[PDB]
Amino acid sequence: LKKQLAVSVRNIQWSYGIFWLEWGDGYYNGDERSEQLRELYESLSLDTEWYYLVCMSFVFNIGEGIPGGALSNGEPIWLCNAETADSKVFTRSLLAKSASLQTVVCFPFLGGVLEIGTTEHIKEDMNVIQSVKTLF
């Protein structure tokens, strides 16, 4: 799915993407590098680049977090003003403040959940969740 995530985030022009229960794979596409990212994390395991990697063990059960809430509810969870959100449903709150991300979106797809995010204001536009699937 590494290619199918790279083709997705680069075209929609968001900064990162995560497929998810533990990680699946991810793709960075903001302002070689994704690869640079996995190598280091696995190396250390005994601004946005921080965000992306620190996710790697942000693993939630059914209902917990944004992935778990999208999987068990079966619906996308679009999230605005990520740099002031609350931790009741958006578990990596203080981690998103770090890099001035505004929106984070997570939705069920392909028997898992796909997450997408950017550092700009995007009014809830659900045809771009149709773009990730069609383009894949």
């Binding site: 994390y41 250390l44 395991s45 005994l46 620190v54 063990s57 942000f58 931790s87 578990t91 990596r92 709150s93 203080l94 981690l95």
Partner: peptide, 14 residues
């Protein structure tokens, strides 16, 4: 505060 020590735990793990 439950939020911030999530990050300290992993940041210490790396």
């Amino acid at each position: 505060t439950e939020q911030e020590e999530d990050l300290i735990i992993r940041l210490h793990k790396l």
